[PDB]
Enzyme design. Structure first.
Site, short mmCIF file in Angstrom:
data_model
loop_
_atom_site.label_atom_id
_atom_site.label_comp_id
_atom_site.label_asym_id
_atom_site.label_seq_id
_atom_site.Cartn_x
_atom_site.Cartn_y
_atom_site.Cartn_z
N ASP A 141 -4.59 16.02 15.71
CA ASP A 141 -4.18 16.01 14.30
C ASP A 141 -5.31 15.60 13.43
O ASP A 141 -5.12 14.80 12.51
CB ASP A 141 -2.94 15.16 14.10
N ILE A 188 0.83 -1.21 0.00
CA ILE A 188 0.00 0.00 0.00
C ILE A 188 0.88 1.27 0.00
O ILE A 188 0.86 2.00 -0.99
CB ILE A 188 -1.05 -0.04 1.16
N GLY A 189 1.62 1.53 1.08
CA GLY A 189 2.35 2.78 1.22
C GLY A 189 3.44 2.83 2.27
O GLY A 189 3.96 1.80 2.67
N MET A 207 6.45 1.07 6.96
CA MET A 207 5.60 0.75 5.80
C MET A 207 4.28 0.09 6.15
O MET A 207 4.14 -0.47 7.23
CB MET A 207 6.36 -0.08 4.75
N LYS A 238 0.25 -2.18 9.62
CA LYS A 238 1.29 -1.17 9.73
C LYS A 238 2.55 -1.74 10.40
O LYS A 238 2.40 -2.26 11.49
CB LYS A 238 0.75 -0.01 10.61
#
Length: 340
Positions: free
Chosen positions: A138, A21-22, A27, A43
């Site tokens: 946030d 994914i990202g 990562m 994650k």
């Protein structure tokens, strides 16, 4: 050990068929859960070298495991080594959410019904977070996850703190960690972001962004964030200035040319008038006068959804150090997930 981009992503045997994914925080990848029969998000976190990242990893894990709410991302599982010595990474398993509000706003017009619904779910989740005496700090569209039926879950508690209004004061131009465009005006003037009103501001910015698909206050630097704010709200009143005791912050505001309020109905001509009334109340310059989460839930804009008996509060609020000890605490905090 399973590999993805020539790096260890060590999650098996419960979680198989990894798709990349990202690079979120370490990562991120998706995977198939074999116990529950649903795909999930995973994650990889590697914080043990830095005491700061230990604190953040521990804070997020402690908060997420404490919380149980439909509009807050849960931790389904945590994968790590059986011993402190062998533990080099932690893997956090969460519900796979098909998108987020940032991505959705890049290509999709939101109907007024979707905006209303998303706003309701944001505030329902935030009611719970605030009831636990936690500040998210946030909130922004990429931290609002959505599935294909538009259920929304708040994520990313890496900057979250226990509320501390008695210690909120700071001097003018104090450096701030959270994402610039969603920062309340007082962060740039006299606030450490330790009161609940910091989060309501961010929600107001998200509502504005939902209406037009564009960030309302896209400041290019720290004080430009304040010039964007005052270009819409107009110059603060004498009363609101009298609330800022810090002289440097007050004199800075006094030095600025006068700016008049931009009517919300001119900025958002297709918007529901009740949406704009609520927006005005969330984007109030004076943090003391800014609407509370519960008042926002109770606002006419959300009347179709408002149901305080179905808007739960936290059973166990949060009432109130070297990396070696924090690794022990993260190991301890994640013990409940070990085969047992």
């Amino acid at each position: 050990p399973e590999m993805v981009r020539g790096q260890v992503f060590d999650v098996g045997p419960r979680y198989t068929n990894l798709s990349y994914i990202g690079e979120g925080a370490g990562m991120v990848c998706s995977a198939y859960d074999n116990v529950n029969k649903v795909r999930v998000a995973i994650k990889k976190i590697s914080p043990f070298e830095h005491q700061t990242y230990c604190q953040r990893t521990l804070r997020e894990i402690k908060i997420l495991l404490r919380f149980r709410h439909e509009n807050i991302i849960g931790i389904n599982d945590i994968i790590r080594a059986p011993t402190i010595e062998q533990m080099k990474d932690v893997y956090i398993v969460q519900d796979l959410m098909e998108t987020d509000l940032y991505k959705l706003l890049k290509t999709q017009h939101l109907s007024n019904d979707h905006i209303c619904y998303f706003l309701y779910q944001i505030l329902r989740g935030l009611k719970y977070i605030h009831s636990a005496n936690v500040l998210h700090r946030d909130l922004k569209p990429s931290n609002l996850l959505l599935n294909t039926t538009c259920d929304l879950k708040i994520c990313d508690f890496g900057l979250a703190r226990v509320a501390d209004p008695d210690h909120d004061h700071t001097g003018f131009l104090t450096e701030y960690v959270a994402t610039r465009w969603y920062r309340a005006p007082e962060i740039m003037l006299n606030s450490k972001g330790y009161t609940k009103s910091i989060d309501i501001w961010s929600v107001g910015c998200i509502l504005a962004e939902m209406l037009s698909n564009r960030p309302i206050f896209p400041g290019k630097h720290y004080l430009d964030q304040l010039n964007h704010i005052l270009g819409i709200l107009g110059s603060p009143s004498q009363e609101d200035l009298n609330c800022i005791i810090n002289l440097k912050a007050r004199n800075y505001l006094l030095s600025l040319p006068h700016k008049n309020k931009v009517p919300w109905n001119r900025l958002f001509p297709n918007a529901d008038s009740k949406a704009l009334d609520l927006l005005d109340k969330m984007l109030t310059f004076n943090p003391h006068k800014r609407i509370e989460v519960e008042q926002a839930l109770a606002h006419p804009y959300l009347e179709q959804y408002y149901d305080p008996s179905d808007e739960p509060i936290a059973e166990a609020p949060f009432k109130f150090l070297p990396k070696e000890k924090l690794k022990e605490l993260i190991f301890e905090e994640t013990a409940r997930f070990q085969p047992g």
